[PDB]
Design a protein around this ligand. Structure first.
Ligand SMILES: *[C@@H]1O[C@H](CO)[C@@H](O)[C@H](O)[C@H]1NC(C)=O
Ligand SMILES: *[C@@H]1O[C@H](CO)[C@@H](O)[C@H](O)[C@H]1NC(C)=O
Ligand SMILES: *[C@@H]1O[C@H](CO)[C@@H](O)[C@H](O)[C@H]1NC(C)=O
Ligand SMILES: *[C@@H]1O[C@H](CO)[C@@H](O)[C@H](O)[C@H]1NC(C)=O
Ligand SMILES: [Zn+2]
Length: 696
């Protein structure tokens, strides 16, 4: 009774290639499950990390290349535009011939880049106001600097949009980098050298004198300014409670409580907001309600901005925008970027042009590219079977509530209601394939010229920002997907109470109608459980069945949750990551993903046990002396096999919201008695500790 099919042999081969039977399962299951993987697969020169997910993403890019690179006679206007955008992106002849000219033509429209301008004060200094300069980058280009103003869903009224004020993103990956001492020194030095190189190239291209000493002074001052801004931002552990982050008030209250003097001019919040919303023909009064996510940042900004001139501020602001544009310019400009990416990520090589270009088109025309991808790569039978697996795991979560004693009967009822109201999205929205008209209308305003890639990306920035700002007075679309189809990932939205499984993740090793159901439950089954469990993690539990930020917990059940979850903060906090020079994981930053992993694997195992109880044991795999209980856990581990560069691991441990793959496997399996039963693990072996954490 061993499976004899081609598919079982190829499944068995894959499992055997990746594992290492010269390790004990109960000593380190990562090594046992992924030892073979780690010996075989090296981290590509273009990758900062590598694993099952990255390999599937590289393979997805090849499908996108193959469906984008050839015209077809029967292509609708949406597909033609996507293919025209791709062709403009890969034509490096046309891009190299234009040098930096497209950036030079644009710079006046953002009030210039002083370091790269002769007589900046005379040209722009007079007419310059923080309000107009920040609004312009925001409204026209989608770039948020100093003050992050955006139109988003109201946390407390999930059917409406509201204007948010938040701290902005930094030029370096996180605030920690702006210490610029020790492991960060390389990054900060490369960041300034990147600024100077682009400044030198713009000056050389406009035939201005290059004073090397002057470039250094100015760009070292941009870094000094951004050091203060970063130091003013709230830490991720102070932004992880959505109730304390929500602070609704009026533009009037804002004008009083968060006063700023910028360039010696009192900042007008009303002038700032109207500068942005006036681009979509919407007026704003002092009565306008606004969510402030970063009160303490705005307060710390006041003393900082007193010490800096318009010239100092625009040198930072314009640079933050130029950073995002370099990859759309000539070979020469991309050289300066590659050096900084090496210093930061440890990558020695630039990603293949056609890979970067496929990903750009997918990111900007997700429905058009999704349509092409699913026709090319996606079965159709997959949608039905996965919809069934989601049904089973959703019911397993609901049934599991009865076993959860630390929750009272009323909190159990509220949880079941949320679980029943979770909106599932599988593969792709049918309308991208079946409704040509709706898809065309989505991209109607977009008109791409094939010899103008830079004009094409600038048009894309205006299009996206326009669409987002003009939602302020509209209601949230309930039919909208939080992911395109050509994506190797899965998501939960607390605001929509929605789980998405794009076509990209519904392939081996996660899922196949052909592969064993033990592998399906251990792969996509655990991924389904994970994303359902996100609705009930330290963040998601604060939102109710309609995505409204409202406490549906008793004080006792809430205390109990914190108690249970605290176990997992300490468990993962005690993990020492050797690729990060033995630094400990941040148990608080990773808690959400850690709750989801532990919860998700348990839900998936129970669903598989129920599947067995009904449909009975299935045929073993040839060449593997393993039962199907063991294959479930083995596929789980192999789904998360991967490795990281020591360069982008000693840094990323402090900010990462996911645990590394090895601790995702070790952490969850340590907390599973079912794992230790399937591999008969001796009590107090590394993988079978006596203390086991659990929430869901
Ligand atoms: C690329 O651009 C060049 C220069 O503008 C143009 O002559 C050529 O037709 C384009 N080639 C392709 C393959 O699109
Ligand atoms: C950082 O901000 C705090 C107050 O928010 C201040 O005490 C400190 O001087 C700031 N600057 C640096 C370099 O830490
Ligand atoms: C904001 O103030 C500037 C002058 O500083 C003015 O030219 C502009 O029209 C104002 N914009 C709005 C939207 O009030
Ligand atoms: C490690 O676990 C111990 C015992 O549970 C706990 O006291 C400690 O806080 C944990 N360490 C970290 C860094 O989280
Ligand atoms: Zn997750």
């Amino acid at each position: 009774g061993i499976c004899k099919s081609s598919d079982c042999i190829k499944s068995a081969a894959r499992l055997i290639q990746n594992m290492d039977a010269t390790t004990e399962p109960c000593t380190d299951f990562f090594k046992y499950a992924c030892g073979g993987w780690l010996k075989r697969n090296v981290i590509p020169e273009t990758s900062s990390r590598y694993g099952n997910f990255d390999i599937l993403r590289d393979e997805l890019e090849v499908v996108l290349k193959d469906v984008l690179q050839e015209p077809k006679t029967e292509d609708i206007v949406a597909v033609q535009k996507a293919k025209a955008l791709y062709r403009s992106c890969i034509n490096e002849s046309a891009i190299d011939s234009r040098g930096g000219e497209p950036l030079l033509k644009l710079l006046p429209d953002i009030y210039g880049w002083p370091v790269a301008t002769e007589n900046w004060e005379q040209k722009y200094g007079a007419s310059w106001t923080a309000e107009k300069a920040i609004a312009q980058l925001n409204s026209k280009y989608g770039k948020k600097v100093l003050i992050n103003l955006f139109v988003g869903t109201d946390d407390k009224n999930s059917v409406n949009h509201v204007i948010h004020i938040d701290q902005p993103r930094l030029g370096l990956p996180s605030r920690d980098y702006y210490e610029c001492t020790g492991i960060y020194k390389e990054a900060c030095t490369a960041y300034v050298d990147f600024m100077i190189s682009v400044a030198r190239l713009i000056r050389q291209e406009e035939r201005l004198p290059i004073d090397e000493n002057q470039l250094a002074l100015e760009m070292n001052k941009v870094m000094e300014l951004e050091k203060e801004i970063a130091n003013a931002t709230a830490k991720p552990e102070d932004r992880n409670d959505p109730m304390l982050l929500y602070n609704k008030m009026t533009l009037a209250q804002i004008q009083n409580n968060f006063s700023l003097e910028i360039n010696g001019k009192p900042f007008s919040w009303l002038n700032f907001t109207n500068e942005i919303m006036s681009t979509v023909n919407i007026s704003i009064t002092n009565e306008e309600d606004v969510v402030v996510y970063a009160p303490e940042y705005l307060t710390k900004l006041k003393p900082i901005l007193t010490k800096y001139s318009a010239r100092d501020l625009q040198n930072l602001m314009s640079w933050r925008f130029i950073m995002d544009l370099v990859s759309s310019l000539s070979r020469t400009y991309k050289e300066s970027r590659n050096a900084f990416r090496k210093a930061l990520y440890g990558t020695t090589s630039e990603t293949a042009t056609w890979r970067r270009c496929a990903n750009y088109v997918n990111g900007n025309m997700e429905n058009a590219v999704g349509r092409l991808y699913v026709e090319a790569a996606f079965a159709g039978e997959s949608k039905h079977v996965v919809e069934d697996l989601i049904a089973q795991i959703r019911e397993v979560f609901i049934q599991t509530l009865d076993d959860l004693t630390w929750m009272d009967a009323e909190t159990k009822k509220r949880a079941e209601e949320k679980a029943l109201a979770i909106k599932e999205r599988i593969g792709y929205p049918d309308d991208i394939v079946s409704n040509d008209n709706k898809l065309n209308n989505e991209y109607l305003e977009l008109n791409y010229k094939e010899d103008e890639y830079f004009e094409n990306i600038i048009q894309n920035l205006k299009f996206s920002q326009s669409k987002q700002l003009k939602k302020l007075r509209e209601k949230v679309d309930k039919d909208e997907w939080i992911s395109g189809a050509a994506v190797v990932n899965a998501f939960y939205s607390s605001g929509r109470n929605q789980i998405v499984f794009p076509a990209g993740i519904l392939q081996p090793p996660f899922f196949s109608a052909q592969q064993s159901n033990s592998l399906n439950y251990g792969g996509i089954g655990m991924v389904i459980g994970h994303d359902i469990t996100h609705g009930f993690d330290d963040n998601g539990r604060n939102f109710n069945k309609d995505g409204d930020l409202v406490d549906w917990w008793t004080q006792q059940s809430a205390s109990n949750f914190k108690e249970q979850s605290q176990c997992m903060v300490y468990q993962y906090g005690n993990f020492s990551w050797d690729l990060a020079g033995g630094q400990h994981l941040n148990g608080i930053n990773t808690l959400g993903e850690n709750i989801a992993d532990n919860g998700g694997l348990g839900q998936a195992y129970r669903a598989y046990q129920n599947y067995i109880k009904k449909n009975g044991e299935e045929k073993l795999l040839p060449g593997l002396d393993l039962n199907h209980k063991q294959l479930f856990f083995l596929n789980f581990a192999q789904v998360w096999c991967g490795t990281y560069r020591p360069e982008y691991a000693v840094n990323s441990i402090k900010t990462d919201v996911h645990s590394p793959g090895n601790f995702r496997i070790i952490g969850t399996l340590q907390n599973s008695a079912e794992f230790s039963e399937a591999f008969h693990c001796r009590k107090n072996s590394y993988m079978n500790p006596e203390k086991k954490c659990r929430v869901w």
